[PDB]
Amino acid sequence: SELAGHQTSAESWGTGRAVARIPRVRGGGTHRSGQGAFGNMCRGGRMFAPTKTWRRWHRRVNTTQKRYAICSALAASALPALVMSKGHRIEEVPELPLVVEDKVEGYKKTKEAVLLLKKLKAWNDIKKVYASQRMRAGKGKMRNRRRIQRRGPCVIYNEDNGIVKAFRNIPGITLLNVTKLNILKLAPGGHVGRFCIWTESAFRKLDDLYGTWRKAASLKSNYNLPMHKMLNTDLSRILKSPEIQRALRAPRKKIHRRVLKKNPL
Amino acid sequence: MKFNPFVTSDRSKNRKRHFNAPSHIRRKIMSSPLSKELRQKYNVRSMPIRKDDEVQVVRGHYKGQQIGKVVQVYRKKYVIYIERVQREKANGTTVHVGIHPSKVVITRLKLDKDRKKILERKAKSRQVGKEKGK
RNA sequence: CGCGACCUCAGAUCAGACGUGGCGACCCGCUGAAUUUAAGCAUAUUAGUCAGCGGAGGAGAAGAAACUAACCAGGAUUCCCUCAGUAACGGCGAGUGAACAGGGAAGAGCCCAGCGCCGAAUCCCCGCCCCGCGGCGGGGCGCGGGACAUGUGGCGUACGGAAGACCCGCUCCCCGGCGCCGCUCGUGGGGGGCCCAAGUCCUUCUGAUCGAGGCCCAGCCCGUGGACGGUGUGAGGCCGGUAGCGGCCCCCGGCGCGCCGGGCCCGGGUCUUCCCGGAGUCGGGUUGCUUGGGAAUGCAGCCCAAAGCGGGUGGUAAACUCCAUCUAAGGCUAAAUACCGGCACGAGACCGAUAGUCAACAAGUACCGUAAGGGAAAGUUGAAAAGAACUUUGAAGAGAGAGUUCAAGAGGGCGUGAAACCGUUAAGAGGUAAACGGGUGGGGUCCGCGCAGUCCGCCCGGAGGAUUCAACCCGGCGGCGGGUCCGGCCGUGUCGGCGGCCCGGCGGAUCUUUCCCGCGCGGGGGACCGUCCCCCGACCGGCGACCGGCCGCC
RNA sequence: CCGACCCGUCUUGAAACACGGACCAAGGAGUCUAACACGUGCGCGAGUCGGGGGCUCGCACGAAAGCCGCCGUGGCGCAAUGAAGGUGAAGGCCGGCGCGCUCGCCGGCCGAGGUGGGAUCCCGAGGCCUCUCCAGUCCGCCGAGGGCGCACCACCGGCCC
RNA sequence: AAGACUAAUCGAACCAUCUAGUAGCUGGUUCCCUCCGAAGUUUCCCUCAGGAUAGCUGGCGCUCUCGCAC
RNA sequence: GCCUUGAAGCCUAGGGCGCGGGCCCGGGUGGAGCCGCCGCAGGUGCAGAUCUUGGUGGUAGUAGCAAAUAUUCAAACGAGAACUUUGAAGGCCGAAGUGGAGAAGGGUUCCAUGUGAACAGCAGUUGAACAUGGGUCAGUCGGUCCUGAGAGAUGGGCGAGCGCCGUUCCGAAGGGACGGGCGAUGGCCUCCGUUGCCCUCGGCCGAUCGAAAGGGAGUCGGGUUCAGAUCCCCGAAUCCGG
RNA sequence: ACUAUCCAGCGAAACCACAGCCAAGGGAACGGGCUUGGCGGAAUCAGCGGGGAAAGAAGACCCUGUUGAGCUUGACUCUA
RNA sequence: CGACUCUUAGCGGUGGAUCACUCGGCUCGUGCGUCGAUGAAGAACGCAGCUAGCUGCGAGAAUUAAUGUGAAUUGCAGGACACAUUGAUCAUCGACACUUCGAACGCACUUGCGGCCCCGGGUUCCUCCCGGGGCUACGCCUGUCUGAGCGUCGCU
Ligand SMILES: [Mg+2]
Ligand SMILES: [Mg+2]
Ligand SMILES: [Mg+2]
Ligand SMILES: [Mg+2]
Ligand SMILES: [Mg+2]
Ligand SMILES: [Mg+2]
Ligand SMILES: [Mg+2]
Ligand SMILES: [Mg+2]
Ligand SMILES: [Mg+2]
Ligand SMILES: [Mg+2]
Ligand SMILES: [Mg+2]
Ligand SMILES: [Mg+2]
Ligand SMILES: [Mg+2]
Ligand SMILES: [Mg+2]
Ligand SMILES: [Mg+2]
Ligand SMILES: [Mg+2]
Ligand SMILES: [Mg+2]
Ligand SMILES: [Mg+2]
Ligand SMILES: [Mg+2]
Ligand SMILES: [Mg+2]
Ligand SMILES: [Mg+2]
Ligand SMILES: [Mg+2]
Ligand SMILES: [Mg+2]
Ligand SMILES: [Mg+2]
Ligand SMILES: [Mg+2]
Ligand SMILES: [Mg+2]
Ligand SMILES: [Mg+2]
Ligand SMILES: [Mg+2]
Ligand SMILES: [Mg+2]
Ligand SMILES: [Mg+2]
Ligand SMILES: [Mg+2]
Ligand SMILES: [Mg+2]
Ligand SMILES: [Mg+2]
Ligand SMILES: [Mg+2]
Ligand SMILES: [Mg+2]
Ligand SMILES: [Mg+2]
Ligand SMILES: [Mg+2]
Ligand SMILES: [Mg+2]
Ligand SMILES: [Mg+2]
Ligand SMILES: [Mg+2]
Ligand SMILES: [Mg+2]
Ligand SMILES: [Mg+2]
Ligand SMILES: [Mg+2]
Ligand SMILES: [Mg+2]
Ligand SMILES: [Mg+2]
Ligand SMILES: [Mg+2]
Ligand SMILES: [Mg+2]
Ligand SMILES: [Mg+2]
Ligand SMILES: [Mg+2]
Ligand SMILES: [Mg+2]
Ligand SMILES: [Mg+2]
Ligand SMILES: [Mg+2]
Ligand SMILES: [Mg+2]
Ligand SMILES: [Mg+2]
Ligand SMILES: [Mg+2]
Ligand SMILES: [Mg+2]
Ligand SMILES: [Mg+2]
Ligand SMILES: [Mg+2]
Ligand SMILES: [Mg+2]
Ligand SMILES: [Mg+2]
Ligand SMILES: [Mg+2]
Ligand SMILES: [Mg+2]
Ligand SMILES: [Mg+2]
Ligand SMILES: [Mg+2]
């Protein structure tokens, strides 16, 4: 508040009295007569630097960057190693860019949902969520933030006919629409892996969104993908080629140490 | 999950409404379940409790299968008094012991006009619920 | 010398209506400062701001050009972006400081007077009959009163036009009363009320479980429901609730079709007249406040005081002339916008009892002051009072026993329960105040010896016992590698085939405007150019892009 | 046993006969916005930015996210100069018509000028070790010497107001 | 008539607000290790208990070169 | 991931680490939540500021409980007496009093019964304390009435405005009454008041406020309660109005 | 004569870095603490007033401040 | 051996820190956007079987009626409630009622003074006394009633 500490009518007793020259309260037959006011120190006073409401809370970020990153998160959604490292029990799915028939957009019952993931071997990540359901550590319990748990996989569809109301109730699962992707759901926490599940109709039309190398988007009006700075990263394969090895000196592995001077005389 | 924006989902507001509710609401909050037999016949799951209903106790020190009746419904503190559950005080005088009605099972009712009416509305609501969900 | 009138003027407990005061976050009108900055100060700035006086609404105010402009011109008011920290003001110093045009939200225009026509063709109140009555109306009959010619109503207001001739036109719109029917986008206008899925299953801790473990798959069951809260710890399935183009009942809405009453007979293309329209007002002097407004932007006082092809504006005073653009001195209006008070609601990367509202509790309370006024401290027994019966000492307060509870080492200001400061017990020491740093000694308290600590591991030699396999063969299975590139895929990179280019689309400041579509053009066609793709051949980079082969190895 | 004056602060100078300080727990003091300068990091690139508004979500998240003939109205930049009116950034070499006059007219070629220094790069006699002679092709490196010369610096010269 | 009294207050009462008035001047400013490491001097100021200017200090770099037979 | 087979926090002659900031183990208490890693953010680290709020020490069982002549003996209640009560003795106030009554102000402090925590700067069987109950009687005592110095509306004037000046001053300022006439009036319209007039005389001279000591008719004696009397009861009077 | 003094009963405050034996020396030039010498023995009672440069009041004397206010006038600028 | 002084640990005290909880605030946003002379805002006094405060209410006073629900309220009491006359307690809110001051309204602030019409005792109006009820404010608008003027004229 703007008025926290300026309800009073305090005034300093001057010098000549053995007190320490701050404002003090006017008169009375109370405790709070000549106590202390108007200051970060004094009990009942005001905070230092009242927190104002015209702080700068928000941020702008350039569009091309946000599109780049969206492209990056999808890439590492493949590359099993990164998914493993992000903690997703994944070692039984048959293929990592995981894709299914476009029939599942028409399911309506959670039993159809659950039965499916069992077959595709994605239920072990879900059990892992249930295990994680625990309680929070701090004052966030008073503030409507009382429980916490992991994040589970993510399903990406194009056309809705009731898929949402099937997967709505299962915990840790979030639904996305390919036309309106979000970084805050593909890279939760700031890191980059997440176990995502696709459909056919969604998966096919990615070429039309973010373009290939040769052509461009046709749904973004000007966006060609980012270009690589370093094509071949196979560093060991490079340095072990003959071409470079011919163009090298010899190494020198022998090692020389602190010799002890002895006296010739 | 919840979707409606005209109600609360907030710890403080629930508790305040609970500990300051009037009596015609405390009645519902002080509800209690049925046994398996009665459920089957009436096709119902819960009714609010009354003053001559026959009941068992399930949890606590005084659980067991001994059956008793209800004596007094002290809504102001969210408890009830059963006839045989009681303890001796220092002097040698018996006194009752309150218990929350969520922890008891009803075996016999105390029927009358209104209470039959009430059961019937519950039955038809569930009935169309099953037949339309199915 | 009585009556009509107004110059006019008072009275009444006359009949019937009205205004006053309060809140005051947002709004309108007046009045109106000093601290401070200038490193001093007097103009300036702070500031048309705090305080002060009035007046309102759910918004208010403004508002349909006496405009902007100088263009091939736009076209009421209000808010946003930008023009712009600019043009300009300024002890030209500190410092101040707009508008137009452009792009958006929203979008709606209209009445009087005065000229002029119509038998004042107009309004209010009492009386009686009939409908309707809880936002007092409608219809009818009174030689019933009154206002009005010192000017009421119809036509008509500069959009420039408006009235009185000549030919077409096809002739329903509203309200006063009385019924009807379909629930009316967040995917059901509003409000209120009652209801709707699934474990208290087996084994086991505990003071009591919402715990751990198990039930063909986090397992039994539900699931458009796994948000939250309560119950003797932590609850998808015990309870309330939650989701649902879920159900039942009640009232209030409006949107439209029927039936009488009454009104209104109410249009548009070629000639003669009308208006040229609103005075102590514009405008000009002199003064004072204000403004970015500068030989005076705006406002107000006092003096002087107009005209009618006139008047105003055209950002440097004045005269002479050409242009452009508006028509003052009368009036009304919704939407886009504002909101630290009020009535209801939701939410939070916020504070968590010396913090956050002064106020988490019988707080604007107790209390100080003659009054204006000032103004606090203060949260927690336990699951449940089961809140210590009875014995005994003492005048009682306080105590020793007993008893309740898992716990009173939880006993009515009782969660835990720090430090300073005290009481007691154990050890140790004591004439240069105490305390301190480095170096050793002595003593106690505890840790580990072990009541040996003899530490362990590889291979070779020896004496003892023991039971499978391996060594080598055969059978199946799996995997690594290979290149005489064995046969086939696939992938790229240009090429060869223009081969989809019309058998597929996208674009073009290239032409055909060889055409059309409605007529200098807006669009589809026709070429043309590029750009995405079809059939076979090649090789590099066959690369870490996959098979079936044959071979060796494990 | 030896050593050893109480901490903070002002000060040329404090153990001070210079101020503050009995003792304990809790609180307590370099912030937020607006504008500028430079340094670093990311993205696009002679262009680059939707921040205002609109199209899609009822908003559980999320008062988010995505998108736009708005796609650039506009702002910063690509061009300076003058009080203003206003003007507005390249040359040469050769041949034809007048007298190279520190000068005007017809046709081709190059072209942001040069001097000095200059990381790297290029050519390269003769080769460094070749169990012997000569022939001697691939590969380093030498190394005489000689050239193309980046940014940047100093100077000369030229063009615009 | 003493600059005396005006609610324990008078060479201009008291109450609230403007108001967190201004201060070239006093007092205070919260964990560690490593590294580099000062001035009290010039000119100008209604300047002499103070500021601007240069000097003294640090950090971030960049162009070159050498025991690299130069 | 840790956890009612025991979290946070707190204590510790215990074992140990790091140059240091700090940390990990072990034991006791206690009763429900807490931490490690990669990034984000901030109301982020105290010895002081004649710092703010609260609490506690030496001082210190100290300085003190000294203005106004003065106490003693016995008995009673009682657990209990230097201080209560009763009696007796000695002494002070000395009628401008340490006496008996009242105004201003206070507001149940008044009276009885009971209590002994707290308060009564020692004590207390007592109390103006604590608890529970009870108590103020008017035709004549005061107010109410009048006006005083003076305050203050109307009309009028002035003022941006809430409003201010001013009190007979720029006012058609009293509803005042009455004898007569006129028709009416209900009561047996006799006698009336009356709503109504025609007459009829009319000054005032300024609304209103303003004193419990000024002005203002009339009450005295006796008796009665734990506490009330010019008020209650007894008995004798008196003023005003009709 | 009332106290102070002793005993019973009740019971505060100001002040307080740590504390409390001296000479000389040097030092911010007049030290309880340092240095060289003198010396040093529990816990306490009534007094007195040499020291503690003893307590109180952010020195009113003096100076500075581009901090003020009361009063006067022939200071400057204004005004009823 | 003792006291006394100092240090460390264990236990007991004093005092209330830290830790964990929370029916409170602050901040943002959505919707609606309503006082009164038919007597407001605010003040005073009063009301419970046992009741001081806070809270609620107004002499019908910890609440009446009427709808919805459907067996309690509670610290003690006493009684009621028959829930198939129907209807305890709660909540809602459409009928009824709503003390004295206050813009505050008969004149004035002491609760003091009055005036008019009507009913009932005052008797049978007739006037004094008592009770009770309704009226008795300032400004202003339209209209009615009675009126004033050496104001302007007409008339006999
Ligand atoms: Mg505060
Ligand atoms: Mg915490
Ligand atoms: Mg008003
Ligand atoms: Mg100044
Ligand atoms: Mg200054
Ligand atoms: Mg000054
Ligand atoms: Mg100004
Ligand atoms: Mg104001
Ligand atoms: Mg308006
Ligand atoms: Mg600019
Ligand atoms: Mg200004
Ligand atoms: Mg514009
Ligand atoms: Mg629009
Ligand atoms: Mg729970
Ligand atoms: Mg739960
Ligand atoms: Mg349920
Ligand atoms: Mg003028
Ligand atoms: Mg100005
Ligand atoms: Mg107009
Ligand atoms: Mg208007
Ligand atoms: Mg507290
Ligand atoms: Mg606390
Ligand atoms: Mg507080
Ligand atoms: Mg315990
Ligand atoms: Mg406890
Ligand atoms: Mg405790
Ligand atoms: Mg001890
Ligand atoms: Mg110094
Ligand atoms: Mg000095
Ligand atoms: Mg020092
Ligand atoms: Mg000295
Ligand atoms: Mg000082
Ligand atoms: Mg001191
Ligand atoms: Mg602290
Ligand atoms: Mg930069
Ligand atoms: Mg003098
Ligand atoms: Mg400050
Ligand atoms: Mg100084
Ligand atoms: Mg100075
Ligand atoms: Mg607990
Ligand atoms: Mg914080
Ligand atoms: Mg801080
Ligand atoms: Mg501290
Ligand atoms: Mg410090
Ligand atoms: Mg003594
Ligand atoms: Mg005495
Ligand atoms: Mg007396
Ligand atoms: Mg006396
Ligand atoms: Mg008296
Ligand atoms: Mg005493
Ligand atoms: Mg007494
Ligand atoms: Mg009087
Ligand atoms: Mg008298
Ligand atoms: Mg003494
Ligand atoms: Mg000496
Ligand atoms: Mg000396
Ligand atoms: Mg000393
Ligand atoms: Mg002395
Ligand atoms: Mg001083
Ligand atoms: Mg001083
Ligand atoms: Mg100076
Ligand atoms: Mg003064
Ligand atoms: Mg002069
Ligand atoms: Mg506590």
Side-chain angles (χ1 to χ4, degrees):
Chain A
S1 186
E2 295 177 354
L3 299 169
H6 301 291
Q7 299 293 332
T8 53
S9 65
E11 193 269 328
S12 69
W13 303 350
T15 192
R17 299 184 178 181
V19 296
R21 297 176 70 194
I22 61 176
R24 293 188 170 197
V25 175
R26 297 288 190 94
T30 62
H31 293 281
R32 188 166 172 80
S33 297
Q35 272 189 351
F38 293 178
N40 54 2
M41 299 169 285
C42 295
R43 175 179 186 278
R46 66 180 164 79
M47 185 177 69
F48 177 69
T51 51
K52 306 292 181 187
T53 303
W54 55 88
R55 190 180 294 181
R56 191 172 69 92
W57 302 96
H58 299 94
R59 296 293 187 274
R60 189 173 74 266
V61 181
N62 295 328
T63 301
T64 63
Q65 288 179 346
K66 299 187 285 186
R67 287 173 177 172
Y68 194 113
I70 289 172
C71 294
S72 176
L74 290 168
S77 68
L79 303 177
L82 300 175
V83 178
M84 291 289 290
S85 303
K86 187 67 179 293
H88 293 281
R89 297 290 299 282
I90 196 169
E91 303 85 352
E92 298 184 353
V93 307
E95 183 172 2
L96 176 63
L98 185 59
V99 176
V100 295
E101 188 182 358
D102 195 5
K103 185 179 76 170
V104 301
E105 298 186 353
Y107 288 169
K108 297 181 287 185
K109 298 290 188 292
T110 310
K111 290 180 181 294
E112 294 175 353
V114 169
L115 186 63
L116 185 143
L117 297 175
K118 299 280 180 64
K119 299 292 182 179
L120 296 176
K121 302 290 180 183
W123 190 250
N124 289 309
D125 194 358
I126 303 293
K127 303 193 185 179
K128 196 177 183 178
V129 173
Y130 287 159
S132 65
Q133 285 175 352
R134 66 188 186 279
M135 193 60 66
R136 191 179 286 265
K139 300 292 182 190
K141 306 196 288 290
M142 293 179 186
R143 294 178 183 182
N144 302 320
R145 295 197 295 274
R146 187 173 185 191
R147 292 181 182 82
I148 53 175
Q149 62 187 354
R150 296 286 180 274
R151 297 289 184 181
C154 184
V155 179
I156 302 169
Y157 67 95
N158 190 1
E159 188 176 0
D160 190 359
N161 292 316
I163 188 168
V164 180
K165 292 186 174 182
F167 291 175
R168 176 183 283 172
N169 204 20
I170 298 160
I173 292 168
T174 186
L175 282 294
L176 290 177
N177 189 358
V178 67
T179 59
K180 298 192 291 186
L181 283 166
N182 187 355
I183 195 70
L184 301 166
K185 300 289 183 179
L186 300 178
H191 314 295
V192 71
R194 191 174 183 178
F195 177 54
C196 294
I197 302 167
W198 298 88
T199 56
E200 186 182 1
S201 66
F203 185 82
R204 292 182 66 94
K205 69 184 286 185
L206 286 173
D207 285 325
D208 296 330
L209 295 167
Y210 300 170
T212 62
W213 304 112
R214 291 177 177 85
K215 66 180 183 181
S218 65
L219 299 170
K220 295 287 183 69
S221 72
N222 49 11
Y223 186 75
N224 289 316
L225 297 173
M227 292 293 168
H228 286 277
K229 196 184 287 185
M230 187 181 175
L231 273 293
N232 189 359
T233 65
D234 296 331
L235 188 64
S236 178
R237 181 64 178 270
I238 292 166
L239 295 173
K240 295 181 93 290
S241 69
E243 290 174 350
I244 284 173
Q245 291 289 325
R246 295 186 287 106
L248 300 177
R249 63 178 175 76
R252 64 181 69 103
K253 306 293 180 68
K254 185 69 182 293
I255 193 173
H256 295 89
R257 294 181 180 176
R258 188 180 183 277
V259 56
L260 180 59
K261 190 184 177 185
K262 292 180 177 180
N263 192 353
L265 293 173
Chain B
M1 198 67 209
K2 173 160 197 137
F3 295 165
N4 189 3
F6 293 105
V7 299
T8 187
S9 64
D10 187 358
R11 188 183 174 86
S12 58
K13 289 181 180 177
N14 292 111
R15 295 171 66 83
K16 180 174 168 61
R17 294 177 188 171
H18 182 271
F19 297 117
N20 288 324
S23 293
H24 72 278
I25 298 166
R26 295 167 90 98
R27 181 175 181 273
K28 289 188 289 297
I29 296 166
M30 294 179 74
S31 301
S32 177
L34 273 64
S35 295
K36 302 289 176 67
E37 290 80 3
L38 297 170
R39 286 175 63 184
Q40 186 179 2
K41 179 168 74 178
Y42 296 102
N43 191 3
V44 71
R45 189 175 175 91
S46 71
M47 285 295 293
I49 198 161
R50 200 183 174 277
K51 189 173 183 295
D52 193 0
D53 294 334
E54 205 73 27
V55 72
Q56 294 186 357
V57 176
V58 176
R59 295 282 198 266
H61 186 189
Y62 298 119
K63 63 181 176 186
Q65 299 295 328
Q66 294 295 110
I67 300 166
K69 72 189 288 295
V70 175
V71 172
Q72 185 175 3
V73 180
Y74 190 79
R75 289 179 178 175
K76 185 172 173 68
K77 191 169 74 173
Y78 290 98
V79 294
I80 56 172
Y81 290 169
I82 313 299
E83 64 181 5
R84 287 179 185 177
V85 71
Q86 64 195 354
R87 65 177 288 154
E88 63 181 0
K89 188 164 75 70
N91 292 314
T93 65
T94 58
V95 64
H96 295 93
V97 175
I99 54 170
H100 191 272
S102 68
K103 300 295 186 295
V104 299
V105 173
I106 295 165
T107 64
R108 186 178 296 112
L109 291 170
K110 179 65 181 293
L111 280 78
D112 59 359
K113 181 64 171 177
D114 290 330
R115 188 170 283 263
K116 291 183 178 68
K117 183 181 76 174
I118 292 163
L119 269 74
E120 295 293 329
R121 291 184 294 181
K122 293 193 174 185
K124 294 183 286 293
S125 298
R126 179 171 293 184
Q127 184 60 250
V128 65
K130 295 192 186 302
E131 299 295 329
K132 298 290 183 289
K134 294 182 280 184

